């Protein structure tokens, strides 16, 4: 599934708040490197909320295929002001890209 059409999704709906590479500075959100296979509220250097580091789950393909519909439903009282992608095809393509760009 497209990492190429998944790049467009990230640029459009996420990039204005997130960096994906290591040594990428935190803007209105932490750097997304070291995502797949890591706990919530992980990225060293950002001041997280008492709700997100505390959700305490591993970040994998399918669990965040669900957080991606509603970032506020799967995690209460967060500062992630994103209404979520509802479709599956689009979530599939953003997740595909992310595993590439957020590690190497």
């Amino acid at each position: 599934g497209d990492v190429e059409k998944g790049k467009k999704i990230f640029v459009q709906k996420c990039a204005q708040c997130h960096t994906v590479e290591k040594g990428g500075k935190h803007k209105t959100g932490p750097n997304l490197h070291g995502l797949f296979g890591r706990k919530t509220g992980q990225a060293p250097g950002f001041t997280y909320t008492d709700a997100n580091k505390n959700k305490g789950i591993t970040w994998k393909e399918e669990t965040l295929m669900e957080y991606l519909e509603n970032p506020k439903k799967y995690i209460p009282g967060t500062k992630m002001i994103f209404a979520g992608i509802k479709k599956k095809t689009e979530r599939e393509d953003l997740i595909a890209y992310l595993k590439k760009a957020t590690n190497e």
Binding site: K8, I9, V11, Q12, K13, Q16, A83, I85, K86, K87, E90
Partner: protein, 294 residues
């Protein structure tokens, strides 16, 4: 040669409950076909359709406007100023066939109210009753504004729509949505970063970026930022004028004031030329997909 009145008539037996459904159908499709124009969605082209159908109004003789839904005809549809809106029309077409009773004017305008609301923007009170009028009441091409002019033209243009300085600057904030396409308008680029989220970004960008006048491949001049944003010469006019600038600064500082002023002005823009009786319903405040748990 003149004297027209356009009375609103609610599409036979239709209530508020019927209208929330057609709003939801537009909202659920904005969510579905969100792949368009590199994931911006159809939201911005729908806001612009709502304005281009309404922006053809003339207070002098009461011609043009949203009422007649004359965009469904070839003269207004093929209007060189209406280039790019065909995409918004084709989007609204399957919805028009799921709800055949709704008038073209009511659908085009509701599509604009749906777009702004689902884009995390203010609630826009909307009224039904626009009736489809025959082919001969289609306004001539050229009622829409040009983008390469000054503050003088923007002020003069909007008087034909009875818009004062506070209303035009509020309406111009819709430019926080979408982008300009070279193949349509002869201009290229977005005004902001979040061009699918209704905010006061337009004014902030206008006041804070280093704007440089550059000429594009269509041979038109546009103001560009090295942050990847652009501003039309008419959008720049708002800071080249002291009256307009006073209001741009006011909105850049307070979003909730811009939101409040946009609703009032956008509703006015879509209701211009339409006479609402007493045996007419109150403006509808539609619930967003989020508020109905959909």
């Amino acid at each position: 040669t003149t004297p027209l009145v356009h009375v609103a008539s609610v599409e036979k037996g239709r209530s508020y409950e019927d209208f929330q459904k057609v709003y939801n159908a537009i909202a659920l499709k904005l969510r579905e076909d969100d792949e368009y124009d590199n994931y911006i969605g159809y939201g911005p082209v729908l806001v612009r359709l709502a304005w281009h159908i309404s922006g053809t109004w003339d207070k002098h003789d009461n011609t043009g406007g949203s009422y007649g839904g004359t965009y469904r005809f070839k003269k207004e549809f093929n209007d060189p100023s209406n280039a790019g809106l065909q995409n918004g029309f084709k989007f609204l077409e399957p919805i028009h066939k799921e709800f055949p009773w709704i008038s073209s004017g009511d659908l085009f305008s509701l599509g604009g109210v749906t777009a702004v609301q689902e884009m995390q923007g203010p609630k826009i009170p909307w009224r039904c009753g626009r009736v489809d009028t025959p082919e001969d009441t289609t306004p001539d091409n050229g009622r829409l504004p040009d983008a390469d002019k000054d503050a003088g033209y923007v002020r003069t243009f909007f008087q034909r729509l009875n818009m004062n300085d506070r209303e035009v600057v509020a309406l111009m904030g819709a430019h926080a949505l979408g982008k300009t396409h070279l193949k349509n308008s002869g201009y290229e680029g977005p005004w902001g970063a979040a061009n699918n989220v209704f905010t006061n970004e337009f004014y902030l960008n206008l006041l804070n970026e280093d704007w440089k006048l550059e000429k594009n491949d269509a041979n038109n001049e546009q103001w560009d930022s090295k942050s990847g944003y652009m501003m039309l010469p008419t959008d720049y006019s708002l800071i080249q004028d002291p009256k307009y600038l006073s209001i741009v600064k006011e909105y850049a500082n307070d979003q909730d004031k811009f939101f409040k002023d946009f609703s009032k002005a956008f509703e006015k823009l879509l209701e211009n030329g339409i006479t609402f009786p007493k045996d007419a319903p109150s403006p509808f405040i539609f619930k967003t997909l989020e508020e109905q748990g959909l």
